[PDB]
From Swiss-Prot:
Signal peptide: none annotated. It comes from the Viruses. The chain holds residues 559 to 769 of 1069 of the full protein. The active site is at 121 (nucleophile), 158. This is Protease VP4. Residues 1-198 form the Peptidase S50 domain.
Length: 198
């Protein structure tokens, strides 16, 4: 059958991030990462960057990867993805992000002791990160079907992670939690470039 929409109260904490290093990225895309235990739920940003930045991961996540739809690796992510990236990517938890004047950013990369990231709501970030020469000021969420976005659960808790550092949640969620709704990959790259203005 199809879903029942139900309301659920969640106890949310922010990840304590550890082993903090400011690194300068000329490119990468942000996306939200949610997890649930007995007790508490978490919402955080991670940054997807093209190439292998394994050196920047915790050891406890370094060996984990998912395949992209053209057989590349996304280091830090768990099972193929729909998305075709023509590059490996690595995703990293981040506590904050300081843009420079040129579209680049100093990104506080952290260790959170979370497991490898499951699910495909990162697909929009993957895409932009595999193609853009700048760090869009926004976080992205949405699974991909070809170039059509599909809506993800947890929009509202996802938006928390973005708003915590002054960024919109952009993409598509089942609960309308995004600040701006974007149904295609073209519109998300349009939005990413727009995000760079003032």
């Amino acid at each position: 059958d199809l879903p029942i929409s139900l309301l659920q109260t969640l106890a949310y904490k922010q990840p304590l991030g550890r082993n903090s290093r400011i690194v300068h990225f000329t490119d990468g895309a942000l996306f939200p990462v949610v997890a649930f235990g007995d007790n508490h739920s978490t919402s955080e940003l991670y940054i997807a960057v093209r190439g292998d930045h394994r050196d920047l991961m915790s050891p406890d996540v370094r060996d984990s990867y998912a395949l992209t739809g053209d057989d590349h690796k996304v280091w830090g992510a768990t099972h193929k993805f729909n998305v075709k990236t023509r590059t490996d990517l690595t995703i990293l938890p981040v506590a904050d992000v300081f843009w420079r004047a040129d579209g680049s950013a100093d990104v506080d990369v952290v260790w959170n002791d979370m497991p490898a990231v499951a699910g495909q709501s990162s697909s929009i970030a993957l895409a932009l990160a595999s193609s853009l020469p700048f760090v869009p000021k926004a976080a992205y969420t949405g699974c991909l079907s070809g170039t059509n976005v599909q809506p993800v659960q947890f929009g509202n808790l996802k938006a928390r992670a973005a708003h915590k550092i002054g960024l919109p949640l952009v993409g598509m969620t089942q609960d309308g939690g995004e600040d701006t709704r974007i149904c295609t990959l073209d519109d998300a790259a349009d939005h990413a470039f727009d995000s760079m203005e003032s």
